[PDB]
Design a protein around this ligand. Structure first.
Ligand SMILES: *[C@@H]1O[C@H](CO)[C@@H](O[C@@H]2O[C@H](CO)[C@@H](O[C@@H]3O[C@H](CO[C@H]4O[C@H](CO)[C@@H](O)[C@H](O)[C@@H]4O)[C@@H](O)[C@H](O[C@H]4O[C@H](CO)[C@@H](O)[C@H](O)[C@@H]4O)[C@@H]3O)[C@H](O)[C@H]2NC(C)=O)[C@H](O)[C@H]1NC(C)=O
Ligand SMILES: *[C@@H]1O[C@H](CO)[C@@H](O[C@@H]2O[C@H](CO)[C@@H](O)[C@H](O)[C@H]2NC(C)=O)[C@H](O)[C@H]1NC(C)=O
Ligand SMILES: *[C@@H]1O[C@H](CO)[C@@H](O[C@@H]2O[C@H](CO)[C@@H](O)[C@H](O)[C@H]2NC(C)=O)[C@H](O)[C@H]1NC(C)=O
Ligand SMILES: *[C@@H]1O[C@H](CO)[C@@H](O[C@@H]2O[C@H](CO)[C@@H](O)[C@H](O)[C@H]2NC(C)=O)[C@H](O)[C@H]1NC(C)=O
Ligand code: NAG
Ligand code: NAG
Lengths: 51, 50, 50, 51, 308, 50
């Protein structure tokens, strides 16, 4: 990784939902759901054949 | 939490429990768990190395 | 005043009326931290004043 | 000010050498003007720097 | 070579200025130590014969009467002028007298000897008498490790309290001292009111604070005289701090026989060559030594290889 | 490098730096008009670089 960006659930300027989603994302990130989601869609067809 | 300080510029990792009590900024450094292992040497390639 | 006493100025620092409570400036943030290499270290110098 | 009782200006001229005072205006009589210069020659103050 | 008389009277000696009572010569700083014998102290009571040149706030020719061993000592008074002082006592069983001199003066001097035989009060080490405190280390030669643990190995203070111990280094005749810190650690860095290490030069007086270290790093100082003094002020709450210095006598080079010439403005004695311990900045002395041989497969005939 | 290893790779004078390349393993940095003087009058030294 050359640069270091990051995605994020966008909210309006001064929204009440920013703090409640931040607590919700950190809860999902430690239970392992955001590794279950990424390995469901970036899993792909399951390549290489013998590597 | 007791307002005896203002910032916490330190290796203070954002987690679930600390975020529920205090408030962090967005991460200035991201990281994870990785593995140390000794760099390979090649001093004993067996005895039938020919 | 008294020649072999100098000024005995009372000056009291007490009888001022309640007008100004001190430290009226930009608040200096007491940033707490912990020492850990290479995040926060002590500087390696010989001169003492810090 | 020159000292009142004594006529020895060594404690005065030493404070004038130390303070780097090379430009002096004496307000004296000529009987005391000859007395200071013998006490300014006994010290190192009759140089090419002093006026 | 010129200070005056020291005269060893059975209790307290009268000290003269250089060339009493004529004009004392310029640039003279004698460092007179009252030995102040055990079970007692000193009481001077200056003479009426007294003339040392007056000054504004005595920043010129004066006479410090600091109660204390040397240098850093607490001050009693600073006497300059023609009015003869009096009323000198002591608050401990040592007192130090220094008599400085500028370059353009004229003055007479001072005289006082002794008055004191009662016994002191406090019991610093524990008991009845217990001096203030006996760490006066006279050591010299070509080299020697000045270690901080000598306060405890030689047992001159109780564990727990504050320490103040003084090492004095003499050198070989007509030489200087290359002090070098091998180990140096403290427990409250950047705080010279709690623990520091200072180095002196020629005398233990206040003129020669060449370096005061109370930070994380100590460096190599290079003295100009044949006398060097190292102290260590560590208080009650920080008696864990340590340092291990190493002095080395040297002469400025034209290097001759019985010299080695480390290439850093130093002639060291040849006893310091392959001493096992590095004595110069870069180990020029600990080089080209221990160069044994070639043996090879001959000495490989052993318990493991030699059986095969 | 040189700020870390002070009193190790920081010489005291030009004469010691010549006597350290000549004896030890050392890469002394100095003026270019002295290197063209030393190399011409000490045939076992050289100038590398520009
Ligand atoms: C009439 O008055 C008295 C007798 O009644 C005579 O003495 C004058 O009064 C006082 C004496 O205490 C002098 O005041 C102070 O003099 C100081 C001068 O420094 C001394 O310097 C050396 C020692 O360092 C001595 O040899 C020398 O004689 C001096 O004594 C000043 O430094 C003083 O300034 C400050 O001192 C204290 C600070 O705590 C304060 O009380 C002062 O107000 C001031 O802030 C102070 O000046 C006074 O100088 C004496 N006069 C003279 C001319 O010396 C008088 O002589 C006598 N006659 C006359 C004409 O006044
Ligand atoms: C300087 O003035 C103060 C008053 O502001 C003096 O203090 C008082 O002095 C009187 C008489 O000496 C005492 O009865 C009081 O008890 C003192 N009060 C306090 C709070 O100190 C002071 O003594 C004067 N200084 C000198 C040197 O005389
Ligand atoms: C100039 O004088 C004024 C008037 O006395 C000082 O201001 C007052 O000081 C008194 C105490 O002496 C206080 O009780 C008042 O509250 C002060 N008033 C204000 C408006 O500050 C002032 O301190 C003096 N200035 C200086 C520089 O000494
Ligand atoms: C080739 O060069 C090396 C360079 O180190 C030489 O070894 C040094 O030569 C100097 C000559 O002034 C002497 O001090 C010693 O012989 C060596 N110095 C040391 C070991 O510190 C030597 O001329 C040659 N060495 C070999 C192995 O051929
Ligand atoms: C120093 O040199 C002298 C001769 O100059 C020699 O005898 C002595 O052993 C050396 N070492 C010491 C510690 O004096
Ligand atoms: C260079 O090598 C040594 C010093 O390293 C010196 O004695 C020798 O004479 C020199 N060789 C030359 C100048 O050819």
């Amino acid at each position: 990784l050359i640069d270091s960006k990051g995605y994020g659930v966008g909210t309006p300027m001064g929204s009440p939902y920013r703090d409640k989603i931040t607590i919700a994302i950190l809860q999902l990130q430690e239970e392992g759901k955001l590794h279950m989601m990424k390995e469901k869609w970036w899993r792909g067809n399951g390549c290489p054949e013998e590597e | 939490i007791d307002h005896k300080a203002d910032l916490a510029v330190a290796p203070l990792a954002i987690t679930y429990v600390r975020e529920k009590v205090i408030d962090f900024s967005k991460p200035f450094m991201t990281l994870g768990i990785s593995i140390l292992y000794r760099k390979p040497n090649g001093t004993n390639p067996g005895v039938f190395s020919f | 005043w008294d020649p072999a006493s100098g000024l005995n100025m009372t000056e009291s620092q007490k009888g001022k009326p309640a007008n100004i409570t001190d430290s009226l400036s930009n608040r200096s943030l007491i940033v707490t931290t912990i020492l850990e290499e290479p995040y926060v270290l002590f500087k390696k110098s010989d001169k003492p004043l810090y | 000010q020159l000292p009142a009782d004594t006529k020895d200006a060594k404690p005065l001229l030493k404070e004038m050498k130390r303070g780097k005072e090379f430009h002096v205006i004496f307000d004296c009589s000529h009987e005391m003007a000859a007395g200071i210069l013998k006490q300014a020659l006994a010290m190192g103050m009759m140089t090419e720097y002093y006026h | 070579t010129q200070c005056g008389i020291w005269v060893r009277t059975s209790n307290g000696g009268h000290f003269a200025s250089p060339n009493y009572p004529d004009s004392y010569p310029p640039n003279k700083e004698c460092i007179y130590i009252l030995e102040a014998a055990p079970r007692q102290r000193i009481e001077l009571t200056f003479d009426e014969r007294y003339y040392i040149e007056p000054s504004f706030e005595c920043r010129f020719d004066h006479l410090e009467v600091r109660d204390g061993p040397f240098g850093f000592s607490p001050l009693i008074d600073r006497y300059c002028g023609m009015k003869s002082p009096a009323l000198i006592r002591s608050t401990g069983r040592f007192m130090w007298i220094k008599f400085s001199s500028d370059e353009e003066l004229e003055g007479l001097g001072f005289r006082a000897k002794y008055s004191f035989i009662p016994d002191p009060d406090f019991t610093y080490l524990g008991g009845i008498l217990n001096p203030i405190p006996d760490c006066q280390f006279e050591l010299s030669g070509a080299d020697g490790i000045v270690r901080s643990s000598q306060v405890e190995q030689e047992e001159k203070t109780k564990p727990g309290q504050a320490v103040d111990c003084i090492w004095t280094i003499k050198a070989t005749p007509k030489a200087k001292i290359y002090l070098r810190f091998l180990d140096y650690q403290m427990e409250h860095s950047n705080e010279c009111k709690r623990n520091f290490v200072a180095v002196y030069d020629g005398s233990s007086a206040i003129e020669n604070l060449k370096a005061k270290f109370c930070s994380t790093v100590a460096n190599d100082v290079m003295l100009k005289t044949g006398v060097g003094v190292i102290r260590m002020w560590a208080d009650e709450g920080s008696r864990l701090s340590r340092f291990r210095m190493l002095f080395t006598s040297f002469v400025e080079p034209p290097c001759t026989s019985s010299t080695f010439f480390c290439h850093s403005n130093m002639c060291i004695n040849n006893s310091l060559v392959c001493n096992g311990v590095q004595n110069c900045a870069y180990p020029w002395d600990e080089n080209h030594c221990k160069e044994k041989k070639k043996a090879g497969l001959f000495e490989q005939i052993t318990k493991t290889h030699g059986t095969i | 490098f040189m700020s870390s290893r002070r009193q190790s790779v920081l010489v005291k004078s030009n004469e010691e730096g010549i006597q350290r390349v000549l004896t030890s393993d050392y890469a002394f940095l100095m003026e270019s008009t002295t290197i063209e003087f030393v190399t011409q009058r000490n045939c076992n030294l050289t100038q590398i670089g520009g």
